[PDB]
Paper text:
The eukaryotic chaperonin TRiC/CCT assists the folding of about 10% of cytosolic proteins through an ATP-driven conformational cycle, and the essential cytoskeleton protein tubulin is the obligate substrate of TRiC. TRiC is the most complex chaperone system identified to date. It has a double-ring structure, and each ring consists of eight paralogous subunits (denoted as CCT1–CCT8) arranged in a specific order. Each TRiC subunit consists of three domains: the substrate-recognition apical domain (A domain) and the ATP-binding equatorial domain (E domain) linked by the intermediate domain (I domain). Here, we present an ensemble of cryo-EM structures of endogenous human TRiC throughout its ATPase cycle, with three of them revealing endogenously engaged tubulin in different folding stages.
In the current work, our control experiment of cryo-EM analysis on human TRiC incubated for 30 s with 1 mM ATP, a physiological concentration of ATP in the cell, further revealed the ability of human TRiC to close both rings, with a non-negligible population (27.2%) of such closed TRiC being detected.
Residue numbers in the entry:
A (entry chain g): 15 to 526
B (entry chain e): 18 to 135
C (entry chain z): 6 to 526
D (entry chain q): 7 to 529
E (entry chain h): 6 to 99
The structure:
């Protein structure tokens, strides 16, 4: 029914620790696999940490908060999600100071919040800048996601696809350098071909099918008209349908239906465009006038899709077709191609101009390959987005967590009070990241982790991480595990904030 | 057909069971014999109540499932065409002949031989 | 430590469950390996009995109760789709890899190190297979040895020689001048009321529905083939009209008017016959797929035509390529250019039905393999043995290299791995040692099914050594080491190559499963 | 939960482990099947009390009837049963042979497998010795049929086949079946068991039975027509009554005046229907249903013979003979669906009117054996003895070779195979010697059914066959264990009867040994 | 799992013959005391409730209708005794 007292905070630990203990071995390139039993007897062997916790039914409420926060992390960054839950579970894994020591939660919460500002300032000291003009340096960065995949052969092509696409969407004049993949970077798939044939289309491609055989197949200078309203007989303010039981009245309603549709379509063809793009649907009587003009009929195009077309060919959005002016034209468009590609109808408005957006064309032999190439380029574009926002890299392979753990230990000597004990626990909680990398490789954990702490004490903390494949110690200047700083900052801010949120709840009450 | 759950009574115990069923009717009417005989209470299926000591009327109102007990009732239809008074005396006499016949069956005398003696 | 209505195994016991699943499946399918092996019975529950030694059938069709063993059943499905053989030896190797690795895992060795040993041993065994294969040209004498080796396992060693000449001759005719070969060029048919030894070749195609009329010719020496999709039965009005009748008799009068469109088309068939080769010692055949009116059957029967109707789609497809007749959807376009050519056409009468033989053709690019058997399940067992024999010969002609059989290659690879020092990790040799002893399960199982000792048979074949190349194998009858190349025992190269790739990937993923969790179950 | 079930990975199908020996419990299923039909072998075989699925009480010693009534649900046991169905093909005898002999191979195979011999060596041992049996069997042929088509010779051969089925009637049924068989024999290759049809009639006893030509039906002629040569015959399964159309045809009967109108209408409907039969020229009409009283008047009006057959199988016999199909409607005038017959007349044999359909102009194999009996249970078993007798001579239409009966060939063939198994070295000698001892099951089962000690009979047979005296079988007597010459007694079996029986029974036992496990599957 | 009979009741050998002998004595027991002119009578009631009283052996056997298969054999012999002779059914059964 409900829980109260120390059992809530002690229960929230076991709930968050149990969820974390599953994916502990899912981190790293050597990460172990898992087995899920379907209710019908099926088996899913996927090692992806996002798919595992998605199919697991969790009873405890705090266990749901661990999953919902990880799902939000996937939207912003498609990497490092597993590291968030491991750190969020390890920081809460030490219950000694929580209960046995009889310390008040706010005393411990103040320790994490002070340790959070120190973990952020340490990463900026050990970071390194990046030259975004050279595409060779961006190649080894993206290869982190490309490795152990089937696109490794086309990896050289996969880099140019994600790099040039994000650079177009990035608008640096505003000062915030905002990049939106879910709109301007929108991707569609093309059946047929091979992986090499995949290129980056400059423009906005529409998947609308060809309804009638009369359309413009190829145009040197396309003309595009953008208007929101649908082409139909004008109705009343309500949705009430028109019911006519008399034949004489049918001729009165049909004449009004043919007159208004022909009137709006007459003002559209006055400019003589090559296509008509409407936001809503298009009736059958309206398509009869569109096929007579020998122009392409396009409908069901959202607002964001229309905003990109207006900046591409120079179009203009008008509320009603009767108000269309000469300002709406498609002048400047490269070509218009309705030609069938891969047994599917495509539309190319592509041009020589950069309307803060583009379209990615995915070629492939089968739909199984298309699904593999798609998801592999998605996170690769997010890697390009995270680097262009903060062009700074931090050493990976566990070198970043150990470099911060050494700074927290040295600073705790000057801290005087009861908060020094939980403040040092954060330094030992960051060692779980290099620990799982060694355990998955098979090498001894205690022997290597002890010698690793001696390297950051003497040598520079920017190097000497942990090799995941081999298992020994290697510098990060000689290896490509360098990771973007924007990912590590979001990881530590989320791991600490989630651990604080669960400690603040001392009672679970059921009611509405 | 319908051989299962078929009631069967055979052997020497069958004769002693038939006599016991016959003595139940004779012991009932022997109290009503004579002018001073006690009456009997009759409750009809419809709720009517009547009181009579007449033996022929009692046998008509008695509902008995046992087969030998039904034979005792069929005798009343034959005697009422002649006497109609001492009909009870015949049922009592029939019960006395069977009651004394029970002592003879223990000696090993065949039933047909007993019926020849009467 | 788990959520309600579920179960999880945190410790290594989750790995022990998967190992016990492979060992249980290994003991079931080890008895059917080799010709001396036994047979498994398939009961569908409806009273149907099926008997086959094929590993792909005993897995794909039979549903396994244990969840983990069902994954291996799906692997043999993709295994048979590529090579077509080796599904039985695939499971036996996977079971031994997990068994030999269990000895080292129980000592505290991490599974990842063992999996790295399999990858290093797979490349060494794959490069050693390069020197074993023989580049000799494929001829009739070699294809017989490949056919006998593949058939002897799926039959009683009786129909082998009967089915040997049927499989070899069917492949040689459909491939000339290094042309890509397709098994869809060969048709499989089944007849009843005949002994199982009556299986023979069919040069043409076997047709289901024959001709019905007393005057139909039982055999026609020469004739032309006219392909038609048109139905000659009763049809509605072709032009624009309707049903106008004052009685039941007037409606039947419009029937003759609607039939006039078809009856005039029936005369066009008779006209074309007399125009092109309408003299003596000639004939004509109607392969028309749709039905034909009985009255139209009488008009065509008097001219010597053998009518056909109610055919299938696959029949008309092969009759188009074999005979050469062009599909004609309307008889107004009827022309002699669409006529084909065929040899002797006769209908062999069975004890029940009658089938049509189009045989004696020049280059039909199609043949048929006719199977005869006393029962239904016997026909199914032979049909599986034929397709398994066709892919064995197809892979032998496509890839000009063949490898010795009878466990000669598996023993030869095990020796090179032991003498091979680790090229990657010092502790990776334990995985190589486990993979080396796993390749020895093939000659061991052949010794059990033959009724001999497992140890004595393996020691003799391993004791064979010389300066030059020496490859020996397990002899089932004698038991002594026997050279598989001399006695005509050969296997396909793509089969042995695919086992090394398949047994390595599947046995690796099983060792990589850390925990078993229940989702929604 | 650990420990798990042994060897069962599939659909809960019971899988016998190594110590469980799945092979033996499959032999045990086929062993119990042989014990049921082992006591029915021979002339002294015990009768079996069988309850039909219709809850009818049947008593018969026939083995083929038992397997139809007793449902065999064991898969490995069906292989021997399916071998018995193939045994009825190419020969009409040897059913009890396969059930007893196939079980004898499996009983002795259990003794070899306990020694540790492989199952593959036991399979190869039978197939080698089986080929030796087919070579020796021709040398055991003593006498052959003279091919004289004489009733004395034809009835003398039926004494063995009728024996073990109907006892005490061996003398009578020998001449009765002979008269029907000698009629077809002049036709080369035309002899067929379906051409001789048996029709049973309730009567005094078997001694009142006779033999007639053509198709003899127990149902008399409803019409007064005696004999007609009309070849047109129309079989109608619909009973004769008021003609009703497949449409609505609602008849509203209100007052007695209209009641007589529609009553006379049915007489007019039956008038036009029978008139359409005489218009087509068909004077013979077969009725599957009942016959109206007024229809008998129009039958004699147009001089059309009427036949009423209540049995459904009697109608199918005419459909496959003269070719007259039974139409669902009431007397459709269709000439194409009629039959052809040369002679049609009514006859009386045994104080019973019988209808005869034969061909006077065309020769024909058509013949009918009329049977009489008091009890339908005993009379039906006589029909089973006739089919086994007729099928015996269907084999003699091929090459005629006869072998001694009464277990005479079984001892002679087991003695010769034992010699080859002793000279042959290796491990195949074990399965060969057990293959020879499997022949001993027949004379043991034949002696036990006669109330004679089995070991005493087997000992005497080896003594007389060792000295070189052939043709010595088992004498049938209750108190006499001794033996007599079969050739002088007239007991002879069929060469092809034993040839095909040994081959089919061999492959039946081999296939069972090849299957070591039974697994259920799902579609 | 796989059973030959699957609920089929069958038995052979000596016990099957002994069981039939005990069943035949039950049929003869009912008509046993009815032999002779002076023999005792029997009382049989049907489903209607009426009682049939007589010493006739042919009438009693018709009303019993025993479901035992071997018992039906002796009943059928009594029916053949009526057509050939018409009496003695009690003597033949006993």
């Amino acid at each position: 029914k409900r829980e109260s007292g120390r059992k809530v905070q002690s229960g929230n630990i076991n709930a968050a620790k149990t969820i974390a203990d599953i994916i502990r071995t899912c981190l790293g390139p050597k990460s172990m696999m898992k087995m899920l039993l379907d209710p019908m007897g099926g088996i899913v062997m996927t090692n992806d940490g996002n798919a595992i916790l998605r199919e697991i039914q969790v009873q405890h409420p705090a266990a749901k908060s661990m999953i919902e926060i990880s799902r939000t992390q996937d939207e912003e960054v498609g990497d490092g999600t597993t590291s968030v839950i491991i750190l969020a579970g390890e920081m809460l894994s030490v219950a000694e100071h929580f209960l046995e020591q009889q310390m008040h939660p706010t005393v411990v919460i103040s320790a994490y919040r002070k340790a959070l500002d120190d973990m952020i300032s340490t990463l900026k000291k050990i970071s390194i800048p990046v030259d975004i003009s050279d595409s060779d340096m961006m190649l080894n960065i993206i290869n982190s996601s490309i490795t152990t995949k089937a696109i490794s052969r086309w990896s050289s092509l996969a880099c140019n696809i994600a790099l040039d696409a994000v650079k177009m969407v990035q608008f640096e004049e505003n000062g915030r350098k905002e990049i939106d993949i879910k709109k301007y970077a929108r991707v569609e798939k093309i059946p047929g071909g091979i992986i090499e044939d995949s290129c980056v289309l400059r423009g906005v491609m529409i998947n609308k099918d060809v309804t009638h055989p009369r359309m413009r197949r190829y145009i040197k200078n396309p003309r595009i008209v953008l208007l929101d309203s649908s082409l139909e007989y004008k109705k009343g303010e309500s949705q009430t349908d028109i019911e006519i039981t008399r034949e004489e009245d049918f001729t009165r309603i049909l004449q009004m239906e043919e007159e208004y549709i022909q009137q709006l379509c007459e003002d559209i063809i006055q400019l003589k465009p090559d296509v008509v793009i409407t936001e809503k649907g298009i009736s059958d009587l309206a398509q009869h006038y569109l096929m007579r003009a020998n122009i392409t009929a396009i409908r069901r195009v959202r607002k964001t899709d229309n905003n990109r077309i207006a900046r591409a060919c120079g179009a203009r959005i008008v509320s009603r077709p009767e108000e269309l002016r000469e300002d709406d034209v498609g002048t400047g468009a490269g070509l218009l191609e309705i030609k069938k590609i891969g047994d599917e109808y495509f539309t190319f408005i592509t041009d020589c101009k950069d309307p803060k957006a583009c379209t990615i064309l995915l070629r492939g032999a089968s739909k199984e390959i298309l699904s593999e190439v798609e998801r592999n380029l998605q996170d690769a574009m997010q890697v390009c987005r995270n680097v262009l926002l903060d062009p700074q890299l931090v050493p990976g392979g566990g070198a970043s967590e150990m470099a911060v753990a050494h700074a927290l230990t040295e600073k705790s000597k000057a801290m005087t009070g009861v908060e020094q004990w939980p403040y040092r626990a954060v330094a030992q909680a960051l060692e779980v990241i290099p620990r799982t990398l060694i355990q998955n490789c098979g090498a001894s954990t205690i022997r290597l982790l002890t010698s690793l702490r001696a390297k950051h004490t003497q040598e520079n903390c920017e190097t000497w991480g942990v090799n995941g494949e081999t298992g020994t110690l290697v510098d990060m200047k000689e290896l490509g595990i360098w990771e973007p700083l924007a990912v590590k900052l979001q990881t530590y801010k989320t791991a600490v904030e989630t651990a604080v949120l669960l400690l603040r709840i001392d009672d679970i009450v059921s009611g509405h | 057909k319908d051989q299962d759950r078929k009631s069967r009574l055979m052997g020497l115990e069958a004769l002693k069971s038939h006599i016991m069923a016959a003595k139940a009717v004779a012991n009932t009417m022997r109290t009503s014999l004579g002018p001073n005989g006690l009456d009997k209470m009759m409750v009809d299926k419809d709720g009517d109540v009547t009181v009579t000591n007449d033996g022929a009327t009692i046998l008509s109102m008695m509902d008995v499932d046992h087969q030998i007990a039904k034979l005792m009732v069929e005798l009343s239809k034959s005697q009422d065409d002649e006497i109609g008074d001492g009909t009870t005396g015949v049922v009592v006499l029939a019960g006395a002949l069977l009651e004394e016949a029970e002592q003879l069956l223990d000696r090993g005398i065949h039933p047909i031989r007993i019926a020849d003696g009467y | 430590t788990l959520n309600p209505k579920a179960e999880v195994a945190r410790a290594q016991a989750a790995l022990a469950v998967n190992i016990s699943a492979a060992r249980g499946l290994q003991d079931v399918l080890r008895t059917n390996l080799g010709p001396k092996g036994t047979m498994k019975m398939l009961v569908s529950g409806a009273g149907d009995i099926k008997l086959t030694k094929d590993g792909n059938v005993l897995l794909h069709e039979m549903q396994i109760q244990h969840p983990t063993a069902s994954l291996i059943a799906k692997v043999a499905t993709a295994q048979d789709d590529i090579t077509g053989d080796g599904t039985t030896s695939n499971v036996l190797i996977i079971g031994e890899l997990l068994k030999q690795a269990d000895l080292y895992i129980s000592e505290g060795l991490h599974p990842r190190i063992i999996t790295e040993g399999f990858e290093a041993a797979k490349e060494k065994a794959l490069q050693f297979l390069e020197e074993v294969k023989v580049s000799r040209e494929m001829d009739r004498e070699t294809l017989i040895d490949v056919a006998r080796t593949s058939l002897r396992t799926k039959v009683h060693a009786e129909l082998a020689d009967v089915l040997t000449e049927a499989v070899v001759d069917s492949i040689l005719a459909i491939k000339k001048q290094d042309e890509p070969i397709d098994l869809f060029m060969i048709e499989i048919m089944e007849m009843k009321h005949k002994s199982e030894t009556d299986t023979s070749l069919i040069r043409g195609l076997v047709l289901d529905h024959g001709a019905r009329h007393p005057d139909m010719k039982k055999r026609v020496e020469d004739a032309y083939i006219l392909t038609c999709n048109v139905s000659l039965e009763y049809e509605k009005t072709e032009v624009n009209s309707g049903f106008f009748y004052k009685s039941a008799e007037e409606r039947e009068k419009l029937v003759k008017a609607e039939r006039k469109f078809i009856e005039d088309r029936v005369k066009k068939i008779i006209e074309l016959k007399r125009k092109v080769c309408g003299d003596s010692d000639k004939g004509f055949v109607v392969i028309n797929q749709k039905g034909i009116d009985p009255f139209s059957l009488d008009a065509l029967s008097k001219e010597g035509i053998v009518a056909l109707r109610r055919a299938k789609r696959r029949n008309m497809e092969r009759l188009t390529l074999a005979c050469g007749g062009v599909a004609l959807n309307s008889f107004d376009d009827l022309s002699p250019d669409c006529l084909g050519h065929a040899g002797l056409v006769y209908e062999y009468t069975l004890g029940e039905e009658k089938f049509t033989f189009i045989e004696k053709c020049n280059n039909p690019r199609s043949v048929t393999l006719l199977i005869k058997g006393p029962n239904k399940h016997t026909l199914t067992q032979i049909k599986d043995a034929v397709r398994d024999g066709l892919r064995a010969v197809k892979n032998a002609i496509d890839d000009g290299c063949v490898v010795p059989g009878a466990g000669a290659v598996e023993v030869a690879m095990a020796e090179a791995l032991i003498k091979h020092k680790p090229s990657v990790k010092g502790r990776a040799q334990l995985g190589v040692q486990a993979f080396a002893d796993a390749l020895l399960i093939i000659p061991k199982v052949l010794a059990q099914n033959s009724g001999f000792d497992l140890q004595e048979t393996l020691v003799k074949i391993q004791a064979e050594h010389s300066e030059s190349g020496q490859l020996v194998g397990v002899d089932l009858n004698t038991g002594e080491p026997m050279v598989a190349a001399e006695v005509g025992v050969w296997d396909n190269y793509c089969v042995k190559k695919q086992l090394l790739h398949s047994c390595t990937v599947i046995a690796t993923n099983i060792l990589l499963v850390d925990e078993i969790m229940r989702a929604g179950m | 939960k650990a420990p798990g079930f042994a060897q069962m990975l599939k659909e809960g199908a019971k899988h016998f482990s190594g110590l469980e020996e799945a092979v033996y419990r499959n032999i045990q299923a086929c062993k119990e099947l042989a014990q049921t039909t082992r006591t029915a072998y021979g002339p002294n075989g015990m009768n079996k009390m069988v309850i039909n699925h219709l809850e009818k009480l049947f008593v018969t010693n026939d083995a083929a009837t038992i397997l139809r009534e007793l449902e065999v649900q064991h898969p490995a046991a069906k292989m021997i049963v399916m071998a018995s169905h193939m045994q009825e093909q190419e020969v009409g005898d040897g059913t009890n042979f396969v059930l007893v002999f196939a079980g004898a191979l499996l009983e002795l195979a259990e003794e070899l497998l306990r020694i540790g011999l492989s199952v593959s060596e036991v399979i190869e041992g039978y197939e080698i010795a089986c080929r030796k049996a087919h070579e020796i069997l021709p040398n055991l042929v003593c006498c052959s049929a003279k091919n004289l088509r004489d009733i004395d010779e034809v009835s003398s051969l039926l004494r063995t086949s009728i024996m073990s089925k109907q006892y005490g009637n061996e003398v009578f049924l020998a001449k009765l079946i002979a008269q029907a068989c000698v009629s077809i024999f002049p036709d080369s290759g035309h002899f067929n068991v379906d051409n001789i049809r048996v029709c049973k009639i309730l009567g005094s006893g078997i001694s009142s039975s006779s033999v007639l030509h053509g198709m003899v039906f127990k149902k008399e002629t409803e019409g007064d027509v005696t004999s007609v040569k009309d070849a047109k015959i129309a079989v109608y399964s619909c009973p004769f009554d008021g003609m009703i159309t497949e449409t609505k045809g609602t008849v509203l009967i209100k007052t007695a005046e209209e009641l007589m109108n529609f009553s006379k209408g049915e007489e007019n409907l039956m008038d036009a229907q029978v008139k359409a039969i005489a218009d087509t020229g068909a004077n013979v009409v077969v009725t599957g249903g009942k016959v109206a009283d007024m229809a008998l008047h129009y039958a004699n009006k147009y001089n059309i013979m009427l036949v009423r057959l209540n049995s459904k199988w009697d109608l199918r016999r005419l459909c496959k003979t003269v070719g007259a199909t039974a139409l669902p409607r009431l007397t459709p005038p269709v000439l194409e669906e009629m039959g052809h017959c040369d002679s049609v007349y009514l006859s009386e044999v045994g104080d019973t009117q019988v209808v005869v359909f034969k061909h006077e102009k065309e020769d024909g194999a058509i013949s009918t054996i009329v049977l009489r009996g008091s009890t339908d249970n005993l009379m039906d078993d006589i029909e089973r003895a006739v089919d086994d007798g007729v099928n015996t001579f269907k084999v003699l239409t091929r090459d005629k070779r006869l072998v001694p009966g009464g277990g005479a060939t079984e001892i002679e063939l087991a003695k010769q195979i034992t010699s080859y198994g002793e000279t042959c070295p290796g491990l195949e000698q074990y399965a060969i010697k057990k293959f020879a001892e499997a022949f001993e099951a027949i004379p043991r089962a034949l002696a036990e059914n006669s109330g004679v000690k089995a070991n005493e009979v087997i000992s005497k047979l080896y003594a007389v066959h060792q000295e070189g005296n052939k043709n010595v079988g088992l004498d049938i007597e209750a108190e006499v264990p001794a033996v007599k010459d079969m050739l002088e007694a007239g007991i002879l079996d069929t060469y092809l009867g034993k040839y095909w029986a040994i081959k089919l029974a061999t492959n039946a036992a081999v296939t069972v040994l090849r299957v070591d496990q039974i697994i259920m599957a799902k579609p | 799992v796989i059973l030959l009979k699957e609920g089929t009741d069958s038995s052979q050998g000596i016990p099957q013959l002994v069981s039939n002998i005990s069943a035949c004595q039950v049929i003869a027991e009912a008509v046993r005391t009815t032999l002779g002119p002076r023999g005792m009578d029997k009382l049989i009631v049907d489903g209607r409730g009426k009682a049939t009283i007589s010493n006739d052996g042919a009438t009693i056997l018709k009303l019993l209708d025993v479901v035992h298969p071997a018992a039906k054999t002796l009943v059928d012999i009594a029916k053949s005794q009526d057509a050939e002779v018409g009496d003695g059914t009690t003597s033949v059964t006993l």
